Short mmCIF file of C-alpha atoms in Angstrom, two decimals:
data_model
loop_
_atom_site.label_atom_id
_atom_site.label_comp_id
_atom_site.label_asym_id
_atom_site.label_seq_id
_atom_site.Cartn_x
_atom_site.Cartn_y
_atom_site.Cartn_z
CA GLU A 1 0.00 0.00 0.00
CA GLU A 2 1.15 3.46 -1.02
CA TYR A 3 1.55 6.52 1.21
CA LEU A 4 -1.31 9.02 0.60
CA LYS A 5 0.76 12.04 1.45
CA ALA A 6 2.56 14.27 -1.01
CA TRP A 7 4.53 17.45 -0.42
CA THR A 8 6.18 19.17 -3.35
CA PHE A 9 9.78 20.15 -4.14
CA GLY B 1 13.85 -14.84 4.62
CA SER B 2 13.84 -11.03 4.52
CA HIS B 3 11.57 -9.02 2.23
CA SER B 4 11.12 -5.58 0.73
CA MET B 5 8.30 -3.54 -0.73
CA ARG B 6 9.16 -0.60 -2.99
CA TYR B 7 7.31 1.85 -5.12
CA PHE B 8 9.19 3.41 -8.04
CA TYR B 9 7.94 6.67 -9.55
CA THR B 10 9.08 8.10 -12.86
CA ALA B 11 7.95 11.59 -13.98
CA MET B 12 9.14 12.56 -17.44
CA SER B 13 8.66 15.97 -19.09
CA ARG B 14 8.40 16.20 -22.89
CA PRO B 15 7.91 19.82 -24.02
CA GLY B 16 5.80 20.05 -27.19
CA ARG B 17 4.39 16.58 -26.64
CA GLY B 18 1.82 17.20 -23.91
CA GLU B 19 2.15 16.91 -20.14
CA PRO B 20 4.85 14.96 -18.27
CA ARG B 21 4.22 11.21 -18.19
CA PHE B 22 3.96 9.78 -14.64
CA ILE B 23 4.52 6.05 -14.05
CA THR B 24 4.38 4.05 -10.81
CA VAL B 25 5.39 0.43 -10.33
CA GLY B 26 5.23 -1.46 -7.03
CA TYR B 27 7.34 -4.50 -6.13
CA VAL B 28 7.51 -7.05 -3.38
CA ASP B 29 11.10 -8.27 -3.64
CA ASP B 30 11.53 -8.89 -7.39
CA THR B 31 7.86 -9.38 -8.11
CA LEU B 32 5.98 -6.52 -9.73
CA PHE B 33 2.46 -6.38 -8.25
CA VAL B 34 1.02 -3.01 -9.25
CA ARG B 35 1.43 -0.43 -12.01
CA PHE B 36 0.01 2.99 -12.98
CA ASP B 37 0.66 4.95 -16.17
CA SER B 38 -0.84 8.39 -16.87
CA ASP B 39 -0.47 7.59 -20.59
CA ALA B 40 -2.81 4.59 -20.21
CA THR B 41 -6.18 4.84 -21.98
CA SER B 42 -7.86 4.98 -18.55
CA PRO B 43 -5.17 5.64 -15.93
CA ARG B 44 -5.56 3.48 -12.87
CA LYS B 45 -3.68 1.28 -10.48
CA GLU B 46 -3.64 -2.12 -12.15
CA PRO B 47 -2.91 -5.52 -10.55
CA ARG B 48 0.16 -7.37 -11.89
CA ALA B 49 0.26 -10.38 -9.55
CA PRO B 50 -2.57 -12.83 -8.61
CA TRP B 51 -2.30 -12.25 -4.85
CA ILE B 52 -3.04 -8.49 -5.03
CA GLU B 53 -6.30 -9.13 -6.93
CA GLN B 54 -7.63 -10.07 -3.47
CA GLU B 55 -7.73 -6.44 -2.27
CA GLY B 56 -11.22 -4.92 -2.39
CA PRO B 57 -12.68 -2.15 -4.63
CA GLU B 58 -11.90 0.42 -1.93
CA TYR B 59 -8.18 -0.49 -2.11
CA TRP B 60 -8.16 0.03 -5.90
CA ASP B 61 -10.07 3.31 -5.63
CA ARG B 62 -7.71 4.71 -2.95
CA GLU B 63 -4.58 3.47 -4.77
CA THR B 64 -5.76 4.97 -8.06
CA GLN B 65 -6.50 8.34 -6.41
CA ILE B 66 -2.95 8.46 -4.95
CA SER B 67 -1.41 7.93 -8.39
CA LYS B 68 -3.81 10.37 -10.10
CA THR B 69 -2.95 13.03 -7.49
CA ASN B 70 0.74 12.12 -7.94
CA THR B 71 0.56 12.75 -11.69
CA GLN B 72 -0.34 16.37 -10.86
CA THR B 73 2.02 16.70 -7.91
CA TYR B 74 4.97 15.44 -9.98
CA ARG B 75 4.17 17.85 -12.79
CA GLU B 76 4.50 20.67 -10.23
CA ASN B 77 7.80 19.13 -8.97
CA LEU B 78 9.15 19.15 -12.55
CA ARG B 79 8.25 22.85 -12.97
CA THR B 80 9.93 23.61 -9.61
CA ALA B 81 13.07 21.57 -10.47
CA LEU B 82 13.41 23.65 -13.66
CA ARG B 83 13.43 26.82 -11.55
CA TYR B 84 15.83 25.42 -8.94
CA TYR B 85 18.40 24.57 -11.68
CA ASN B 86 17.81 27.64 -13.90
CA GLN B 87 16.80 25.35 -16.76
CA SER B 88 14.89 26.26 -19.91
CA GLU B 89 11.46 24.88 -20.70
CA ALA B 90 12.56 23.36 -24.01
CA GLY B 91 14.37 20.38 -22.47
CA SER B 92 13.04 17.09 -21.13
CA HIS B 93 13.71 16.13 -17.54
CA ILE B 94 12.99 13.23 -15.19
CA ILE B 95 12.15 12.97 -11.50
CA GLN B 96 12.35 9.56 -9.89
CA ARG B 97 11.40 8.35 -6.45
CA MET B 98 12.03 5.03 -4.70
CA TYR B 99 10.36 4.45 -1.33
CA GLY B 100 9.35 1.58 0.90
CA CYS B 101 10.46 -0.75 3.61
CA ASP B 102 12.51 -3.85 4.32
CA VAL B 103 11.33 -6.39 6.89
CA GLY B 104 13.18 -9.32 8.51
CA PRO B 105 12.07 -13.00 8.67
CA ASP B 106 9.85 -12.09 11.66
CA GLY B 107 8.29 -9.24 9.70
CA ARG B 108 9.84 -6.50 11.86
CA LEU B 109 10.93 -3.26 10.14
CA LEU B 110 14.57 -3.53 9.13
CA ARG B 111 14.72 -0.10 7.50
CA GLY B 112 12.70 2.41 5.48
CA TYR B 113 13.53 4.51 2.41
CA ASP B 114 12.30 7.60 0.66
CA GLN B 115 14.73 8.69 -2.08
CA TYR B 116 14.45 11.11 -4.99
CA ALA B 117 16.46 11.81 -8.09
CA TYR B 118 16.47 14.47 -10.77
CA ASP B 119 17.85 13.61 -14.20
CA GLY B 120 19.29 10.36 -12.78
CA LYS B 121 21.33 12.11 -10.06
CA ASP B 122 20.64 12.02 -6.30
CA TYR B 123 18.37 14.90 -5.28
CA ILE B 124 17.10 14.24 -1.72
CA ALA B 125 16.85 11.15 0.49
CA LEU B 126 15.33 10.33 3.86
CA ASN B 127 18.22 9.22 6.08
CA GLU B 128 18.08 5.80 7.74
CA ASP B 129 16.99 7.55 10.97
CA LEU B 130 13.68 8.38 9.23
CA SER B 131 13.96 11.81 10.83
CA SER B 132 16.48 13.84 8.74
CA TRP B 133 17.42 14.28 5.03
CA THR B 134 20.48 14.30 2.84
CA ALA B 135 20.26 16.91 0.09
CA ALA B 136 22.66 16.37 -2.80
CA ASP B 137 23.01 20.03 -3.78
CA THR B 138 21.85 23.59 -3.07
CA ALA B 139 18.62 23.01 -5.02
CA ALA B 140 17.66 19.93 -2.96
CA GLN B 141 18.50 22.01 0.14
CA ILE B 142 15.59 24.30 -0.78
CA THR B 143 13.31 21.26 -0.75
CA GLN B 144 14.99 20.11 2.50
CA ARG B 145 14.13 23.38 4.29
CA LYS B 146 10.52 23.08 3.06
CA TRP B 147 10.20 19.45 4.25
CA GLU B 148 11.84 20.16 7.61
CA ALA B 149 9.32 23.02 8.12
CA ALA B 150 6.43 20.75 7.16
CA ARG B 151 7.82 17.90 9.32
CA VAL B 152 7.66 15.58 6.29
CA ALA B 153 10.18 13.07 7.77
CA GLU B 154 7.95 12.45 10.82
CA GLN B 155 5.05 11.66 8.50
CA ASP B 156 7.15 9.41 6.25
CA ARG B 157 8.39 7.57 9.35
CA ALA B 158 4.79 6.99 10.48
CA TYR B 159 4.00 5.43 7.12
CA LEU B 160 7.20 3.35 6.95
CA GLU B 161 6.79 1.97 10.49
CA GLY B 162 3.06 1.38 10.13
CA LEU B 163 1.28 0.90 6.80
CA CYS B 164 4.39 -0.02 4.81
CA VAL B 165 5.18 -3.00 7.06
CA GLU B 166 1.48 -3.85 7.66
CA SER B 167 0.62 -4.10 3.97
CA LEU B 168 3.88 -5.96 3.13
CA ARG B 169 3.10 -8.56 5.86
CA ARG B 170 -0.41 -9.02 4.39
CA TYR B 171 0.99 -9.29 0.83
CA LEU B 172 3.58 -11.85 2.04
CA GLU B 173 0.74 -13.92 3.50
CA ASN B 174 -1.54 -13.59 0.49
CA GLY B 175 1.27 -14.47 -1.91
CA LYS B 176 2.94 -17.01 0.38
CA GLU B 177 3.08 -19.70 -2.35
CA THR B 178 5.28 -17.41 -4.48
CA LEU B 179 6.72 -14.50 -2.51
CA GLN B 180 7.92 -16.87 0.20
CA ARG B 181 9.38 -19.38 -2.25
CA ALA B 182 12.99 -19.18 -3.42
CA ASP B 183 13.77 -21.05 -6.61
CA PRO B 184 17.39 -22.23 -6.67
CA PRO B 185 19.45 -21.76 -9.81
CA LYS B 186 19.73 -24.62 -12.24
CA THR B 187 23.47 -24.65 -12.99
CA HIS B 188 25.93 -26.03 -15.59
CA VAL B 189 29.28 -25.18 -17.17
CA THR B 190 29.60 -25.01 -20.95
CA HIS B 191 32.85 -25.35 -22.91
CA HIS B 192 33.59 -23.38 -26.09
CA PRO B 193 37.02 -23.43 -27.72
CA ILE B 194 38.12 -19.92 -28.72
CA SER B 195 41.34 -21.08 -30.44
CA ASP B 196 43.90 -23.90 -30.25
CA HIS B 197 45.23 -22.05 -27.22
CA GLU B 198 42.18 -20.97 -25.21
CA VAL B 199 38.68 -22.14 -24.30
CA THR B 200 35.81 -20.27 -22.66
CA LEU B 201 34.19 -21.83 -19.63
CA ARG B 202 30.74 -20.39 -19.03
CA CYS B 203 29.02 -20.99 -15.74
CA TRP B 204 25.23 -20.64 -16.08
CA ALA B 205 22.53 -20.09 -13.49
CA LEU B 206 18.95 -20.29 -14.75
CA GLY B 207 15.48 -20.36 -13.27
CA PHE B 208 16.27 -18.62 -9.99
CA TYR B 209 14.21 -16.34 -7.78
CA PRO B 210 14.82 -13.89 -6.18
CA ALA B 211 17.30 -12.11 -8.50
CA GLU B 212 20.12 -11.89 -5.89
CA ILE B 213 22.91 -14.34 -6.73
CA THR B 214 26.70 -14.61 -6.73
CA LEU B 215 28.55 -16.46 -9.48
CA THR B 216 32.33 -16.53 -9.34
CA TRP B 217 35.18 -18.46 -10.89
CA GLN B 218 38.29 -19.54 -9.03
CA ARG B 219 41.57 -20.79 -10.48
CA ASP B 220 43.43 -23.06 -8.03
CA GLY B 221 41.14 -21.69 -5.29
CA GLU B 222 41.73 -18.01 -6.05
CA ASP B 223 39.03 -15.61 -7.27
CA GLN B 224 39.37 -14.56 -10.93
CA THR B 225 37.46 -11.29 -10.48
CA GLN B 226 39.54 -9.38 -13.01
CA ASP B 227 39.44 -12.12 -15.63
CA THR B 228 35.77 -13.10 -15.28
CA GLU B 229 33.16 -11.79 -17.71
CA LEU B 230 29.97 -11.53 -15.70
CA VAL B 231 26.73 -10.46 -17.37
CA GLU B 232 24.01 -8.54 -15.55
CA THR B 233 21.34 -10.70 -13.92
CA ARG B 234 18.48 -10.68 -16.46
CA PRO B 235 14.76 -11.56 -16.31
CA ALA B 236 13.54 -14.76 -18.07
CA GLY B 237 9.91 -13.60 -18.33
CA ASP B 238 8.51 -16.36 -16.09
CA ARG B 239 9.33 -14.50 -12.79
CA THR B 240 12.77 -16.04 -12.71
CA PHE B 241 16.22 -14.73 -13.53
CA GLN B 242 19.35 -15.77 -15.40
CA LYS B 243 23.06 -15.04 -15.01
CA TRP B 244 26.33 -16.35 -16.37
CA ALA B 245 30.05 -15.99 -15.63
CA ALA B 246 32.71 -16.67 -18.26
CA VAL B 247 36.42 -17.23 -17.98
CA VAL B 248 38.99 -17.73 -20.74
CA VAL B 249 41.28 -20.58 -19.79
CA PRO B 250 44.49 -22.06 -21.22
CA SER B 251 43.94 -25.20 -23.26
CA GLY B 252 44.08 -28.30 -21.04
CA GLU B 253 43.85 -26.29 -17.77
CA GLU B 254 40.03 -26.58 -17.43
CA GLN B 255 40.23 -28.61 -14.19
CA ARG B 256 42.05 -25.83 -12.30
CA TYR B 257 38.79 -23.89 -12.56
CA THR B 258 35.71 -24.07 -10.32
CA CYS B 259 32.50 -22.08 -10.49
CA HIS B 260 30.90 -20.96 -7.24
CA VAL B 261 27.22 -20.20 -6.81
CA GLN B 262 25.54 -18.48 -3.90
CA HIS B 263 21.74 -18.09 -3.84
CA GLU B 264 19.15 -18.06 -1.09
CA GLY B 265 17.34 -21.08 -2.62
CA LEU B 266 20.46 -23.21 -2.11
CA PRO B 267 20.89 -24.58 1.43
CA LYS B 268 24.64 -24.38 0.80
CA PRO B 269 26.88 -22.84 -1.92
CA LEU B 270 27.58 -24.98 -4.99
CA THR B 271 30.92 -25.65 -6.58
CA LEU B 272 30.78 -26.48 -10.30
CA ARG B 273 33.35 -27.79 -12.78
CA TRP B 274 33.44 -28.38 -16.51
CA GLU B 275 32.12 -31.94 -16.92
CA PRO B 276 33.50 -33.26 -20.22
CA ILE C 1 25.06 13.36 -18.28
CA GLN C 2 23.44 10.26 -19.77
CA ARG C 3 23.93 6.49 -19.59
CA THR C 4 24.11 4.08 -22.50
CA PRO C 5 21.98 0.94 -22.49
CA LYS C 6 23.49 -2.42 -21.75
CA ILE C 7 21.96 -4.96 -24.15
CA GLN C 8 21.33 -8.69 -23.85
CA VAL C 9 19.49 -10.91 -26.33
CA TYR C 10 18.53 -14.38 -25.10
CA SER C 11 15.80 -16.99 -24.75
CA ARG C 12 13.55 -17.67 -21.78
CA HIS C 13 14.28 -21.39 -21.90
CA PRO C 14 17.38 -23.09 -23.31
CA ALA C 15 17.09 -23.04 -27.10
CA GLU C 16 16.03 -26.16 -28.94
CA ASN C 17 15.23 -26.13 -32.67
CA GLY C 18 11.54 -26.55 -33.49
CA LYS C 19 10.50 -25.97 -29.89
CA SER C 20 8.49 -22.85 -29.06
CA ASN C 21 10.33 -20.43 -26.79
CA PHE C 22 10.51 -16.72 -25.94
CA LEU C 23 13.00 -14.28 -27.41
CA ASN C 24 14.03 -11.58 -24.95
CA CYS C 25 15.85 -8.31 -25.25
CA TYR C 26 16.86 -6.85 -21.93
CA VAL C 27 18.00 -3.25 -21.95
CA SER C 28 19.37 -1.86 -18.72
CA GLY C 29 21.72 0.65 -17.12
CA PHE C 30 20.37 3.51 -19.23
CA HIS C 31 19.34 7.10 -18.62
CA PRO C 32 17.21 8.92 -19.80
CA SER C 33 14.21 6.59 -20.19
CA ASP C 34 13.37 6.99 -23.91
CA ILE C 35 14.60 3.95 -25.78
CA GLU C 36 13.63 2.21 -29.02
CA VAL C 37 13.89 -1.57 -29.14
CA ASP C 38 13.08 -3.87 -32.05
CA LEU C 39 13.37 -7.64 -32.21
CA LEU C 40 14.54 -8.89 -35.59
CA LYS C 41 13.99 -12.17 -37.42
CA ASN C 42 16.29 -12.50 -40.41
CA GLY C 43 16.83 -8.72 -40.30
CA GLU C 44 13.19 -7.71 -40.39
CA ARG C 45 11.17 -6.24 -37.50
CA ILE C 46 8.95 -8.62 -35.51
CA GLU C 47 5.44 -7.27 -35.01
CA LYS C 48 3.50 -6.99 -31.75
CA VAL C 49 6.58 -7.36 -29.47
CA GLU C 50 5.65 -6.71 -25.82
CA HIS C 51 7.62 -4.97 -23.10
CA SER C 52 7.63 -4.85 -19.32
CA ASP C 53 6.67 -1.69 -17.42
CA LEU C 54 9.40 0.96 -17.01
CA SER C 55 11.27 0.36 -13.74
CA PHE C 56 14.74 1.31 -12.49
CA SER C 57 17.63 0.10 -10.34
CA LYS C 58 19.07 1.49 -7.10
CA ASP C 59 21.49 3.65 -9.13
CA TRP C 60 18.44 5.26 -10.86
CA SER C 61 19.13 3.69 -14.25
CA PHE C 62 16.17 2.20 -16.15
CA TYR C 63 15.60 -1.28 -17.40
CA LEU C 64 13.04 -2.84 -19.75
CA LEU C 65 12.40 -6.30 -21.11
CA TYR C 66 11.16 -6.69 -24.68
CA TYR C 67 9.83 -10.12 -25.59
CA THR C 68 8.05 -12.16 -28.24
CA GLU C 69 7.12 -15.81 -28.86
CA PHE C 70 9.55 -17.55 -31.23
CA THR C 71 10.46 -21.00 -32.52
CA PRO C 72 14.23 -21.10 -33.02
CA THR C 73 15.35 -23.05 -36.09
CA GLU C 74 18.70 -23.88 -37.64
CA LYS C 75 18.76 -21.26 -40.40
CA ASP C 76 16.78 -18.34 -38.86
CA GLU C 77 18.80 -15.41 -37.49
CA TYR C 78 17.50 -13.33 -34.60
CA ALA C 79 18.62 -9.99 -33.14
CA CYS C 80 17.80 -6.94 -31.04
CA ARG C 81 18.11 -3.44 -32.51
CA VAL C 82 18.46 -0.64 -29.93
CA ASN C 83 18.40 3.13 -30.17
CA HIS C 84 19.01 5.58 -27.35
CA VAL C 85 20.06 9.23 -27.19
CA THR C 86 23.56 8.01 -26.16
CA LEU C 87 23.85 6.18 -29.51
CA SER C 88 24.88 7.78 -32.81
CA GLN C 89 23.29 4.89 -34.76
CA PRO C 90 21.08 1.94 -33.75
CA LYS C 91 23.01 -0.90 -32.14
CA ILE C 92 22.27 -4.45 -33.32
CA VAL C 93 23.02 -7.39 -31.02
CA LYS C 94 22.67 -10.85 -32.62
CA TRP C 95 21.09 -13.70 -30.70
CA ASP C 96 23.61 -16.38 -29.74
CA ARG C 97 22.13 -19.37 -27.89
CA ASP C 98 25.38 -19.69 -25.93
CA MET C 99 24.97 -16.18 -24.41
#
C-alpha cells in the first residue's frame, strides 16, 4: 500500500 | 527470509508533446504487483500479480486516487526543479522516487527509504533515521528546508513503520506460495574453444528467484574477479532470472577452474566444474 | 550526463530447434528513459513485441524487457536493434544461444 501524502519540491 | 516492498515513480517531461508522463510500479522483492501509467487509456492502479487481486474495490479506488494526485504533484515538482536549476522549458527532464520498507524474517521493520532523483542524479533522500534528510546540492537544500518546516520526515516515518510494514506482511501472507518461495538456480558449465590455445568456460545459473545471486570463478582456489566476464542478472519472463560468468582458460587447464554459486534457494553454496 | 543501455538478447528457456520459446531483449543501465527496441527475425522487425513496465535500479538507471514468442530453427537469425540518445546509430546485437 502506497503513502497518501505528497509534499512538493 | 527477509523481504522488501518498494514503489518506483518516474515523472518525465516532454515539451511540445503534452504533459509529463507519470509512471508508478510497485514490487515485493523482485515481483511486480502493481502499475500505474498516466499515458494509459484509462489511468488506474492495475494488478500485476494474482495475490493483489484479493484487495477490495476500496483499495483500488484509494490506490488509483494516490497515483492520479501524484501525476499532478509530480508535474509541479518538474516545474519547480526547472526553476531550482535555472533550466529552460525546451528540455526534457525526469524525476524519480524510490520508497518503501525492508522487513526481517519475523516481519519487523529492518529499515525504510524515501529517495528522490532528478535527471538520474541524487536529489534528496530520507536518512536511515527516518527523521532527517540528505540533500545532494543547493537546489535539494531548498526542498529540504521546506520538508523540515512541514515535518515531512515524521510523516514518512509513520507510514514506513506502520502501513508499509502492515501491507507488506499481508501481501507476504496472500502471496505465500510465491513471494515466500525461493527457486534455486539450475546450474551447468559449458565449454567453447576460442582457439587452439584458449577455451571459454561459461558458468550458467537459470530459473532462480529472487534475483540476488553470486557467481564466481576460481583458479586453483583463487578468485578470478579481473578475468571473469559476468553479465548482468536478467529476467527470463517467467518471474525467474538468469546469469552467467565466463572465464577464458588455457587449453588443457580446465580442471584448475571451479564455479561458485551463492543463492538463497540453495541450502549451501555450490561448486561447479566443466564436466566433459 | 546520460547512460548508455546495456543490451542482452537471449531466450527464456534453453534453445532447442523446433520448440516454441521466448525471445528476450533486456536493456538496462540507461538514462534517460526513452529507448527504441526492435526484435529482428532475419533482419526484419517482428510485429506486436511486448515490453515490461518501465522500472529502475538502485542507481536510478532504467531497465526494460522486450519479448516475443519464437520458434528457433537452424537457419533463422534473430537480433535486437536498440536506439538511445547516447547512440549515434542503432546498435544491433545478434542472438547467440550460448549467451
